[PDB]
Structures are given as structure tokens and as C-alpha cells.
Amino acid sequence: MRVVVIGAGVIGLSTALCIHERYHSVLQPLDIKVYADRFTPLTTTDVAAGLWQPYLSDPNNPQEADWSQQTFDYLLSHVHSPNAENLGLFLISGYNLFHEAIPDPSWKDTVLGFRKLTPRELDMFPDYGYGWFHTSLILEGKNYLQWLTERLTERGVKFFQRKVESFEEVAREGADVIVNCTGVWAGALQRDPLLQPGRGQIMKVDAPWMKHFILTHDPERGIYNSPYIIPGTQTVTLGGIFQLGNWSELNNIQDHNTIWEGCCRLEPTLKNARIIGERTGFRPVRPQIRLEREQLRTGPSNTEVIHNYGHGGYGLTIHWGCALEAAKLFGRILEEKK
């Protein structure tokens, strides 16, 4: 009853945790190990600020919307436990700014105290004339990945460092079910033209007076290409860069100036704030999340493969709904045994 999960990001770790707590009981003996090329603090998850917020128009797959809601409710039911600081979970309020009047989002009632910005609040941001204010959650990837690792290590889950070159290679090794949580690199295991890197560059600035998140939006520049400021526990994330098809895991100077001159137009207080770090990541951009069960009859035996990747810029927002759905698929393989 052995199962291998490939990848140690928010997807691989929550999926591995979900499957356990759903199939661990005496009658069902379960063996699980995780294979990953990179672990915390070197994953994409470690680069993500952790703000809960879906993509903000009607999703192409209505499933996703419920998975986002499932994640929020799960996280909000945790936000006030003394252990919440170990997963880097806290409550944050903030602004979402626009140039034109857009309809209220689907997640309007998922979030806390959602409302439309007043003219006086809008007068604090002089390039934007419409907007929202609401209370969400930040789930810092660094702390959450440590929490999941701890949680998995005490429940008997072994961890291994290796770069998998094919599913057939891990199938001949022993594993019954393979859980594919490779993120942006899934293509190297099974070609996927739909999956593309959504290059992001961030700036980690020391600004503790910064108490709210500010997200800006314009259909002109596109998604994730507009200034954003996201306070964390130890620093403030300064972003607003999205380059599709870009595989450069190198910090670019032109992007630094774009983020800096954009965030300082929002919060001019940021001009006299020290920079602790700059980092780069690739959002696993896919039109839809691939959360489908696939029988790999092309290789060792009739091996089952659970695909779970392509969560773009909302991996931390959606992860739990996915992890539950993946566990549901694992149960379908189990009931269809013999």
C-alpha cells in the first residue's frame, strides 16, 4: 500500500497530510514518502507572501471557487489558536484598488467585512478611483512548509531529496499510487503545453508601520503586473511583476525599478525603508488546475497517477480544497482495487 508524492511545496505537503488523515486507520495500513528536488526555503511557496485572494473574475472551472472557500474556512477556524504563529497564519485587512468600477467579487462574502472604498479613503491613492476594503488572511509559505514538515515527520512520513526523471522510473521502484505536485516543472515528467512559468520578482523590505496590504489592478498591464505591498510577520513584500514564458531565476534590475517606483507612488513612506532581500519565483500558470486521476498503463503495471499542479499565483489561497479533492481521488483508486 506504498505511495510516493513528488514535490515539497504547499501542494505536495498538504496532499500528503490530507491522504494520511483520510487513510491511516488500523484496517488501512498506509506507507507514504515524499520525493523533492528542493525543500524550504528554496521552493516557489517560500517566495509567495501568502495572501488569501482568488483571481477575482468568474473562474473557468467553478470547482476552484469552492476549493478557495474551503481553504479560507479551514484557515479562519485556526487563526485564533495559540499555534497559529507556527504556520505563519494571521488576519490582515487591506485595499484592492482599480481605475474603473468593476463588479464585486465572488469571494465577497467569503472574506471578512468586505466593502467598497469611500471617496476619502480613495483620496489616499491618487492613480485609482474605485476599490475595495476587506479583512483576509496571510499564510506565510516559509512557516507553513515548516509546520507541514513537522506534522508529517511525527506521523511517520519519510522525506527524500532526488530529481525524478519519469513516472515509470518511480513505478518500477515500488510505489502503487503516484501524486504529482511538481508545480511549474510538471512538464519535465509529462509534457504539458498548457503549463507555463509566470515569472515573479519580489522585494522584501523592512517597514513595520505598514499595517495593510494594498493590491492594485489594471486590465492594461494585466494580472500580477501591477504594484502590490503585502506586510508579513518579519517584513513587507513589494511586488508587481509577471512575465509569462520567462525561466530566468535571476533578479533583474529593470524589474526592481518597476516595483520600487510603483510601490513608492502608493506608499511614499517606503522610500526611506531598508531592503532585506529580493527574490524570484515562477507561478505554475495553467488555464485550469490539473487535478485529475490518470491511469499510467504506459509503464510498470496499471499504475495510478494523481495529478495536482498548475495553481498559478493562488497556490496558498487554494491548496486545502485541492488536498481534500486529491484525497477523494486516492479513495476512488482504493475502492476500485479488487
Ligand X SMILES: Cc1cc2nc3c(=O)[nH]c(=O)nc-3n(C[C@H](O)[C@H](O)[C@H](O)COP(=O)(O)OP(=O)(O)OC[C@H]3O[C@@H](n4cnc5c(N)ncnc54)[C@H](O)[C@@H]3O)c2cc1C
Ligand Y SMILES: O=C(O)c1cc2occ(/C=C\c3ccccc3)c2[nH]1
Asked if residue 240 lies in contact with residue 218, where contact means CB atoms within 8 angstroms, the answer is no
What does 309 interact with, of ligand X, a copy of itself, ligand Y, none (CB < 5 to 8 A by kind)? ligand X
What is the CA angle 299-303-309, rounded to 5?
A: 100
Q: Of residues 36, 273, 289, 327, which one binds ligand X by CB under 6 A? A: 36
| Binding span for ligand Y by CB under 6 A among 49-57, 74-82, 111-119, 264-272 | 49-57
Q: Identify which of residues 15 and 270 has a Cβ nearer to ligand X in the complex.
A: 15
Select the binding partner of residue 284 from a copy of itself, ligand Y, ligand X, none (C-beta < 5 to 8 A, by kind). ligand X
6, 170, 179, 215: which one contacts ligand Y (CB under 6 A)?
215
Measure the CA angle with vertex 20, ends 150 and 147; round to 5°.
Answer: 20
Cell, residue 336:
476500485
Q: How far apart are the first and last CA of the chain?
A: 14
CA 179 distance to own-chain centroid: 17
Q: Which does 197 bind (CB under 5 to 8 A by kind): ligand X, ligand Y, a copy of itself, none?
A: none
**The three grid cell numbers given for residue 310, joined into one nine-digit string:** 498548475
**DSSP β-ladder status, 243-244 and 236-239:** unpaired
Q: Are 18 and 70 in contact (CB under 8 A)?
A: no
Report if residue 98 touches ligand Y, rule: CB under 6 A: no
Contact between 280 and ligand Y (CB under 6 A)? no
Q: Which of 20, 142, 204, 283 binds ligand X (CB under 6 A)?
A: 283
Residue 240 in the binding site for ligand X (CB under 6 A):
no
Report whether 163 belongs to an annotated binding site: yes
Q: How many CB atoms lie within 10 A of CB 143?
A: 20
Return the number of the residue (102 or 122) whose C-beta is nearest ligand Y.
102
Q: Is 317 in the site for ligand Y (CB under 6 A)?
A: yes
163 part of the interface to ligand X, by CB under 6 A: yes
- Helix then strand then coil, in percent of the chain rounded to 5, is 30, 25, 45
Q: Summarize as ranges the residues that interact with ligand X (CB under 6 A).
A: 6-12, 35-38, 43-45, 47-51, 163-164, 181-185, 188-189, 200, 202, 281-284, 309, 311-317
